[model samples]
Structure formats: structure tokens, C-alpha cells
Target chain A: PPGPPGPPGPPGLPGLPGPPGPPGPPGP
Target chain B: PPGPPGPPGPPGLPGLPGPPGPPGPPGPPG
Candidate 1:
């Protein structure tokens, strides 16, 4: 006999956005 | 007789200013 298929997994949740990166050094 | 005077070095040297650098990267979101 054939086996039953399992249910599909739920969609992935989105993570919070990361903080902004540090600024670059000044040029001459 | 006094030694002859030596000729002075050439004059006049002009150099153009360098080109401007590339623009800075975008700032953080408001």
C-alpha cells in the first residue's frame, strides 16, 4: 500500500531590520 | 677682472588643479 504524504510547512517569518552601519572616515 | 655673473635659472612653472573625487555614498534612511 502507498504511504500518506505529510502536510506542507508554514511560511518563514521575517526578522526585524538591522541598525544602520557606522559612517566612513573623512577624506583629504 | 671680476668673474662674469652666471645666468639665473629659468622661471615660470604652473600646474593645473586635480580633478574632483567621486561622490560620497548615500546616507542612512530618514
Candidate 2:
């Protein structure tokens, strides 16, 4: 038998800012 | 102007886990 989907849960807490990516290839 | 983009303000604190959703009409509710 079909069932109703549950209500949306509370929004996720913001995640920590990720560490800066490794310095990319040298340029300008 | 993007003037107030300001020093990317203090990083937000980690968030708590979210509460479970409301029970569904069921065959079975979680």
C-alpha cells in the first residue's frame, strides 16, 4: 500500500568552511 | 558594491544534527 512522505526535517546546520584547496599550478 | 563582503566573517559554528521528520501515513511509520 502507498504511504505519505514524511514532512521535511529541519534544515541542516551549516558546515564548516572547508580548508583552502592546495595551491593550484603557478600562473600570473 | 561588494564592499560589505567584509573579511569573510567568523566561520559559523558546526550545526547540530536535525530532528527526525514527522511520521508518515503507514504501512509502517518510522
Candidate 3:
């Protein structure tokens, strides 16, 4: 049966949001 | 030299991050 894939599993108990993801190295 | 635009001006008052965007209108995948 097709349904919107269930909401992303909750991220366990809350905690300070992870640090801003590191930006990729500058491109050439 | 113009520095990187000052850290995005503080988001004024905090706000709940917007909800995830709606899934794009469907399209062929396979």
C-alpha cells in the first residue's frame, strides 16, 4: 500500500541541534 | 575588500524552522 513514506523517524530525544554542517571545500 | 555579507543578519526574532518543503509534483523515476 502506498502512503507518504512515514514521517522521518523522530530524531531520538532532543538535544542541541548538530553543528551547522561543514561547507564543502572550495571548488577549483 | 567587501567581506562575506555579514553573517546573515540575525533572523530577527527566532522562528520555528519552516516545515520541510512539499514533495515535488510526481514525475517518472525508473
Candidate 4:
């Protein structure tokens, strides 16, 4: 009763742009 | 043999950056 959800699973690898938050604690 | 590929369809929104290519055809005299 669930064979209509297997033709749309080829687009889950574009969430890799969140790694630049480690250089902000020495400006005082 | 056909139930192990339905957990990867939530990443098709990162290919949206193609709207700035209309200004490159007039630079041969400067």
C-alpha cells in the first residue's frame, strides 16, 4: 500500500554551505 | 530490492543561481 514514493529520491546533497564561523573573538 | 531509496529527495533547492549573464558582448575597443 505504499509504492508511489520511490521515484523522487535523487536530490538530497546540496546542504553543504555552513562552515565559516570560527574567527570572531579578538577585536576589542 | 526496491525499498531503500526514498530518503533523499529534499535537497533540490540549491541549484538556483543562474540569473546574471547578460552583459558580456561589447569589449573590444578599450
Candidate 5:
């Protein structure tokens, strides 16, 4: 179902550090 | 030890998309 939960489903974005709860992380 | 638990460390990157562990998402469109 739903394709193995889509492999833990990272970012789901075409760009850097994409997550749900609003633009998270990768600090200096 | 590590400072203040370090506030949920993000993906250390050359600015690339991180992996889904937590704070990731409701991925599949149920």
C-alpha cells in the first residue's frame, strides 16, 4: 500500500533541505 | 557535553535536501 510508505519520504522537494514543519535546518 | 542538546541538528550539507527521519512529513497522499 502507498508504495512502502514511499521510503520514509524525505523533503519531497526538488531543492535543498525541504521538510514539512516550515523551512528547517542546516546551520552555519 | 553537547551544548543544550543542540536544538535538533539539521542536515549538515553543502545545502542539499536532508533525509526523512523526523520533522519530515506526511509523505504519501494517503
Candidate 6:
């Protein structure tokens, strides 16, 4: 039998969508 | 209205799967 399902890689880091989420919540 | 759902930095290349996939022909073994 062949190998079972092999995940090529873990869920990647979304460098693209990363920035917009907070929109600069950096106020202290 | 709010802007579009910004897309992420093109999905990171799998640092992993480094060697990449599995066997080829498996020609020799004596």
C-alpha cells in the first residue's frame, strides 16, 4: 500500500493578509 | 463602505516538504 495522506506543509503564514486585521491598534 | 478583504502575502512557500515528494523509480537493490 502507498503512504497515507501526506500534508506537504503546515498552514502557511499569511504574510499578505497579515497587516490589515488590526489596522494599527497600537495606541498605549 | 469598508474596503475589500485584503489578501495575505502570497502563501509562504513550504519551507518544509524541503526534499519534496516521494520516490521516483526505485531502480536498484541487490
Cα error, candidate 5, residue A23 (Å): 17
Model 4: per-residue Cα lDDT over B1-30, one tens digit each: 444444545535554333433333443453
Best by TM-score: 1
Indicate whether candidate 5 or candidate 6 has the larger lDDT.
5
* TM per prediction: 0.28, 0.27, 0.23, 0.21, 0.15, 0.20
Ranking of models by TM-score: 1, 2, 3, 4, 6, 5
Clashing pairs in 1: none
- Can you write out model 3's per-residue Cα lDDT over A1-28, one digit (the tens) per residue? 3333323333333333433444444343
| Candidate 3 residue spans exceeding 4 A from truth | A1-28, B1-13, B28-30
Regions more than 4 Å wrong, model 1: A1-28, B1-8
Q: Give one digit per residue, the lDDT tens place, for model 2 in A1-28.
A: 3344444455546755544444444333
Clash number for candidate 1: 0
The 0-to-1 C-alpha lDDT of every candidate, in the order given, reads 0.46, 0.44, 0.38, 0.43, 0.40, 0.39
Candidate 2 Cα misplacement greater than 4 A, ranges: A1-28, B1-9, B28-30
Question: Which lDDT tens digits does candidate 6 get at residues B1-30?
Answer: 554544443544533323333334444444
Candidate 5 lDDT tens digits, B1-30: 323322333343254675644553334443
Error of 4 at B8 (Å): 5.5
Q: After superposition, how far is residue B8 of candidate 5 from its true place, in Å?
A: 35
Q: Pairs clashing in candidate 5?
A: A17-B17
* DockQ score of each predicted structure, in the order shown: 0.01, 0.03, 0.02, 0.08, 0.06, 0.03
- CA shift of A23, model 3, Å: 24
Error of 1 at B9 (Å): 3.5
Maximum-DockQ candidate: 4
